[PDB]
Amino acid sequence: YPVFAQQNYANPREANGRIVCANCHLAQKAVEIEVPQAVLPDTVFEAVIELPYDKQVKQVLANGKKGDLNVGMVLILPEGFELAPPDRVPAEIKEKVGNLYYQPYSPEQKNILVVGPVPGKKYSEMVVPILSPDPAKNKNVSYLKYPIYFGGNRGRGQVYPDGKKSNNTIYNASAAGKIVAITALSEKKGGFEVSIEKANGEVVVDKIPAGPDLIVKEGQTVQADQPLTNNPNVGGFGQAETEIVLQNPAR
């Protein structure tokens, strides 16, 4: 979740421009963002983001069951830009925003906003109220064309903060050998146990949680790291970059 990024990465955007969500949300899926080409200083504007996907397709949940997807994002704005205060957000805009609670990536990064998890059904499109800075009061900001970086995700990740794989990813053979057995993990607790008899005769047992479907058969020989299941993931992460000009007014 955005909280996983926050708790494990001080900067959500890596040197090459990759947003850290990608370190765990391994599938790529297009997203979009639009902001006005230009805005006056100390003015509230809207950032409209889209995280499209097929609402009819459900995902594997942590409990192994199928369910709806949820969305989240991280928006990296120029230094000085901030989430617009509620007292600066017009009712018409609060209406478009809805019941969302944008938060700064950290108290020391008010220019980086996150939100989520929130229902994909209702928030595949979101509006972010942003307050532009004033170069006349903030020496760290100028009347320039500034880049804006966006990262948007839908669906559960493939790996956890501890490095363990979630049940929403591909599982591969720990060793090469003949599959001598495939046992159902339980009755309520789905999953499987794949026994691989190595060339030396030792048997290893690979545990596979419920979620992914097996693509291997008993008696089948597999190579080490060969996929033993398909990929159950139906979600993905996408990035988009845009820009905005902080106008320099004067009459």
By three-state DSSP, how is residue 186 classified? coil
Q: How many residues bind ligand HEM (CB under 6 A)?
A: 36
The interface with ligand HEM within residues 80-119 (CB under 6 A) comprises 114, 116-117
53 assigned to a ligand binding site: no
Cα(192)–Cα(159) distance, integer angstroms = 19
Find the helix or strand (DSSP H, E) in which 118 lies: strand 112-119
Interatomic CA distance for residues 222 and 111, integer angstroms: 50
Assess 234 for contact with ligand HEM (CB under 6 A): no
228 counts as binding ligand HEM under rule CB under 6 A: no
> Is the CB of residue 185 less than 8 Å from the CB of residue 171?
no
To the question of whether residue 21 is assigned a binding role by annotation, the answer is yes
- Asked if residue 95 binds a second copy (CB under 8 A), the reply is no
Among ligand HEM, a second copy, none, what does residue 186 contact (CB within 5–8 Å per kind)?
A: a second copy
What does the per-residue mask of binding to a second copy show for 171-210, with x meaning CB under 8 A?
---------------x-xx-x-----------------xx
250 binds a second copy (CB under 8 A): yes
Q: Say how many C-beta atoms besides its own lie within 10 A of residue 96's C-beta.
A: 15
Does the protein bind ligand HEM through residue 1 (CB under 6 A)? yes
| In contact, 150 and 233? CB cutoff 8 Å | no
CB atoms within 10 A of CB 131: 20
Which partner from the list ligand HEM, a second copy, none does 140 bind, CB cut-off 5 to 8 Å by kind?
none
Query: Which residues define the annotated binding site for heme?
Result: 1, 21, 24-25
